[PDB]
Amino acid sequence: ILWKKYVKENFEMNVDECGIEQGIPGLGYNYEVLKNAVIHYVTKGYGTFKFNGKVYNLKQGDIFILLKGMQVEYVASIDDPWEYYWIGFSGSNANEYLNRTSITNSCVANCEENSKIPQIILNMCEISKTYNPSRSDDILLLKELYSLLYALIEEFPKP
Amino acid sequence: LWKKYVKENFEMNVDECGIEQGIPGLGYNYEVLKNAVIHYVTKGYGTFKFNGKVYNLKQGDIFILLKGMQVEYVASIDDPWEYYWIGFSGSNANEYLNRTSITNSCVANCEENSKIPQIILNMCEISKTYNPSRSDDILLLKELYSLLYALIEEFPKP
Ligand SMILES: OC[C@H]1O[C@@H](O[C@H]2[C@H](O)[C@@H](O)[C@H](O)O[C@@H]2CO)[C@H](O)[C@@H](O)[C@H]1O
Numbered sequence: 458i459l460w461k462k463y464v465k466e467n468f469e470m471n472v473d474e475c476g477i478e479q480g481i482p483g484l485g486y487n488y489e490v491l492k493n494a495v496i497h498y499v500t501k502g503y504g505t506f507k508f509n510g511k512v513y514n515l516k517q518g519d520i521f522i523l524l525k526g527m528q529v530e531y532v533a534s535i536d537d538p539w540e541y542y543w544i545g546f547s548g549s550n551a552n553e554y555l556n557r558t559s560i561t562n563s564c565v566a567n568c569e570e571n572s573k574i575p576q577i578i579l580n581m582c583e584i585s586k587t588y589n590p591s592r593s594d595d596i597l598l599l600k601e602l603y604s605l606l607y608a609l610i611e612e613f614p615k616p
Numbered sequence: 617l618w619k620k621y622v623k624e625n626f627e628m629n630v631d632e633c634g635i636e637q638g639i640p641g642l643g644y645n646y647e648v649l650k651n652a653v654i655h656y657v658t659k660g661y662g663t664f665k666f667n668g669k670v671y672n673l674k675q676g677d678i679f680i681l682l683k684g685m686q687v688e689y690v691a692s693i694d695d696p697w698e699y700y701w702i703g704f705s706g707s708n709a710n711e712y713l714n715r716t717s718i719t720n721s722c723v724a725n726c727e728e729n730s731k732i733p734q735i736i737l738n739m740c741e742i743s744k745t746y747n748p749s750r751s752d753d754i755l756l757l758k759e760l761y762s763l764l765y766a767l768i769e770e771f772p773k774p
């Protein structure tokens with residue numbers, strides 16, 4: 458329904474792509490990640506995420522993150538296929554900030570009831586649907602990416 | 617408050633945040649060396665002089681200093697201004713400044729429902745207890761993107 462790809466115009470902090478996908482029962486993806494980092498938020502239904510010999514059964518409110526070099530498989534459930542929203546991002550600041558959160562350890566997490574993460578990801582995907590750089594949507598998306606990385610660090614801090 | 621930060625970023629950078637209560641009849645007369653410095657007048661009165669114009673500024677006014685400007689700004693004798701300032705730099709910062717009309721005269725008034733005052737005050741508050749181990753660096757960049765967005769929204773080019 459949405460897969461907006463942006464230019465790699467920034468090297469410190471960059472929004473690479475925003476997407477929304479309703480899974481087809483029993484179908485998904487099996488590949489080595491090429492993109493820098495892609496955070497997925499499960500909005501509905503059920504799917505599986507497999508990485509490094511572990512198989513996670515994910516549901517509404519779960520996050521999984523893809524990082525360059527990871528061999529992953531993620532597949533919608535046969536009975537009740539997931540919908541997910543994703544933010545792909547890159548840059549030297551982005552990668553330093555990712556090292557301040559525990560989520561990059563296992564690459565899976567659950568959003569707490571009062572999490573700020575869902576609203577930010579949904580808002581970035583909404584902006585991306587009618588992206589207009591002449592209306593400074595580029596500034597708004599970078600503001601939201603900084604808010605997202607701040608929220609990940611606040612909710613999933615390193616020891 | 618006068619917190620100076622490293623020039624650690626080149627696309628978008630918070631250079632400094634400050635708060636100054638002016639001394640009656642005193643101020644500054646110099647060629648600006650910093651990239652860009654937005655000042656917000658929180659109290660009182662002062663004068664800003666640039667390119668042969670003399671502005672009488674008051675609470676709610678903004679003035680912006682840009683590299684190369686020869687400026688004089690002086691607190692009023694009767695009720696000296698307090699001002700808050702955000703110094704910033706970077707290739708993104710300078711592109712975004714070209715999307716606003718405020719860089720034409722370098723003076724403006726914040727309208728009643730403006731988001732600018734709350735952002736500038738919040739950045740100066742964060743800067744007072746700046747702790748990078750608690751990711752205050754990310755928070756200040758988030759607020760700088762919010763500030764430049766607000767300037768474009770409230771002071772658009774025609
Ligand atoms: O990037 C999130 C996005 O990934 C898609 O999978 C793509 C991937 O983006 C691409 O770099 C790789 O070369 O091929 C994959 C397709 O096998 C997913 O299709 C999409 O649902 C999102 O998860």
Ligand SMILES: OC[C@H]1O[C@@H](O[C@H]2[C@H](O)[C@@H](O)[C@H](O)O[C@@H]2CO)[C@H](O)[C@@H](O)[C@H]1O
Pocket residue numbers: 634636644645646648649650653701703
């Ligand atoms: O940068 C805003 C800040 O400027 C101070 O003035 C300094 C200026 O920053 C510095 O670049 C220059 O070399 O010396 C000036 C003092 O003469 C102001 O003092 C301060 O109130 C702010 O306006």
